[PDB]
Amino acid sequence: GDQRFGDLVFRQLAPNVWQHTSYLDMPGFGAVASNGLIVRDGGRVLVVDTAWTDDQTAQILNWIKQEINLPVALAVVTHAHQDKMGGMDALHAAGIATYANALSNQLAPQEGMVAAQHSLTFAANGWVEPATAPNFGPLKVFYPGPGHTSDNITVGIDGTDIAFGGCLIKDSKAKSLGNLGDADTEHYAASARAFGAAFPKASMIVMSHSAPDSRAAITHTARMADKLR
Numbered sequence: 001g002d003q004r005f006g007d008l009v010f011r012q013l014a015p016n017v018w019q020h021t022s023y024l025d026m027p028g029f030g031a032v033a034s035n036g037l038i039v040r041d042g043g044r045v046l047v048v049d050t051a052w053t054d055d056q057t058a059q060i061l062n063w064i065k066q067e068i069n070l071p072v073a074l075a076v077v078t079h080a081h082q083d084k085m086g087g088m089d090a091l092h093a094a095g096i097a098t099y100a101n102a103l104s105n106q107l108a109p110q111e112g113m114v115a116a117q118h119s120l121t122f123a124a125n126g127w128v129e130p131a132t133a134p135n136f137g138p139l140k141v142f143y144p145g146p147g148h149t150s151d152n153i154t155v156g157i158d159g160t161d162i163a164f165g166g167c168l169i170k171d172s173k174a175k176s177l178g179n180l181g182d183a184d185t186e187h188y189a190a191s192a193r194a195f196g197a198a199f200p201k202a203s204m205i206v207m208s209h210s211a212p213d214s215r216a217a218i219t220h221t222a223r224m225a226d227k228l229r
């Protein structure tokens with residue numbers, strides 16, 4: 001079920017995996033939900049994406065302390081927009097090591113974000129260069145190509161059926177891809193397909209702006225991105 005904790009919502013997805021959800025009144029769009037992940041790996045916790053704000057991100061850390069009560073070893077954030085990186089200062093205040101695509105860190109100042117402390121780089125095939133993601137445990141980080149933004153990255157969780165598409169993937173009944181001012185309209189469709197191909201056995205697709213869905217989310221996104229080229 002949806003566990004309400006202050007203004008945030010937490011949902012367990014697997015024995016060691018939870019979805020965090022936070023909301024921001026974005027004028028003209030309503031109160032917009034954004035999802036990220038919390039993963040327990042043995043005696044430590046790994047976070048995927050901040051909440052929209054520092055205060056909300058501190059509340060994620062409070063929930064972790066209450067429900068898991070293990071240290072947060074690292075966080076990885078999936079592109080330089082507010083829903084994914086808006087709470088970076090809260091993670092830094094807590095002493096948590098932070099990681100993002102090198103390009104997200106480069107873009108962070110102009111997008112209004114604080115950069116992560118460490119930069120990920122990626123091989124030509126999209127998989128993270130392993131030395132840039134040390135001690136990531138079950139998190140498998142993949143750059144699918146430019147799409148929702150130039151810098152968007154995705155994360156699979158080893159030992160589960162879960163892959164996280166962030167804001168690249170929309171649910172199987174979404175009817176648009178949202179704002180495309182930062183989107184790569186030429187390459188969006190290929191990038192969405194590359195994410196599905198990188199995590200071929202993931203049956204639960206977690207995304208930023210819809211509840212978890214089947215693999216039909218990936219093909220519907222790619223179909224709609226076909227219409228931007």
Ligand SMILES: C[C@H](CS)C(=O)N1CCCC[C@@H]1C(=O)O
Nearest residue numbers: 029032081082083167177178179
């Ligand atoms: C702050 C987020 C970063 S993805 C954002 O800008 N959006 C999400 C919610 C709807 C509007 C807009 C979009 O259509 O992409």
Ligand SMILES: [Zn+2]
Nearest residue numbers: 079081148167
């Ligand atoms: Zn975005």
Ligand SMILES: [Zn+2]
Nearest residue numbers: 081083167208
């Ligand atoms: Zn988003």
